């Protein structure tokens, strides 16, 4: 509808450059298809993948325009505060085209009381039929959240997040022109994304398989102490 301005196009290009840059080591994708299928193997694979996703999330975030101008402690607080929500959005993207990854998730020590509601959430995200540009912008928007815990200069984060929201609103009009409520529906899903921060945290208190440990990076970012 309303076209992206030239500077908005440039911002989108930087975000898409960064979103498509890093991925998962093929050694890890080899394990998803070939490795033994047991709760123990699944726990180790899935936490290895989640650790890699945090590393990719950090690299993505560092290339968001303006992020490296923010206060350094605020940078850390934004990354840690968004890791789970960004993982949910990525999970949604993957599962809304590997059923083998789903089957491993379902035999990983995680209760069906958690998995079933979360996959229903991923499906509710899939019904929005988002493009990769929309997934990328929504991910950048959740990372640059001015209301996250521990942020000292919230106005500085807000001035980075506001232009992303403007671009996303235009993408919704461009990609789903026959559904003028699309952007509002995306933002409604953002709100429920936040409620699953707590569920994930509550799930972690009981997720254990053969008394295995989470990796050091996951212990940091998921607060497993």
């Amino acid at each position: 509808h309303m076209e992206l301005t030239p500077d908005q196009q440039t911002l989108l290009h930087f975000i898409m450059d960064s979103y498509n840059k890093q991925r998962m080591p093929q050694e890890i994708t080899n394990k998803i298809l070939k490795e033994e299928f047991s709760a123990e193997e699944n726990f180790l694979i899935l936490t290895e993948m989640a650790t890699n996703h945090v590393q990719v999330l950090v690299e993505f975030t560092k290339k968001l325009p303006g992020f490296q101008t923010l206060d350094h402690e605020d940078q850390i607080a934004l990354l840690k505060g968004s890791a789970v929500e960004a993982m949910f959005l990525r999970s949604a993207e993957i599962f809304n085209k590997s059923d083998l990854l789903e089957e491993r998730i379902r035999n990983s020590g995680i209760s069906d009381e958690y998995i079933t509601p979360m996959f229903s959430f991923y499906k509710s995200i899939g019904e929005l039929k988002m493009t990769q540009e929309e997934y990328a912008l929504l991910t950048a928007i959740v990372i640059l959240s001015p209301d996250r815990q521990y942020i000292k200069d919230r106005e500085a984060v807000e001035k980075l997040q506001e232009p992303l929201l403007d671009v996303l609103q235009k993408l919704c009009k461009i990609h789903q022109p026959e559904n003028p409520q699309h952007f509002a529906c995306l933002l409604g899903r953002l709100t429920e994304l936040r409620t699953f921060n707590h569920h994930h945290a509550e799930m972690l208190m009981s997720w254990r398989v053969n008394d295995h440990k989470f990796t050091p990076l996951l212990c940091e970012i998921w607060d497993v102490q």
């Binding site: 840690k80 940091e220 970012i221």
Partner: peptide, 13 residues
Amino acid sequence: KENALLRYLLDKD
């Protein structure tokens, strides 16, 4: 330091 690995990754080029 709190979140030592996260800091390492953020500062590493």
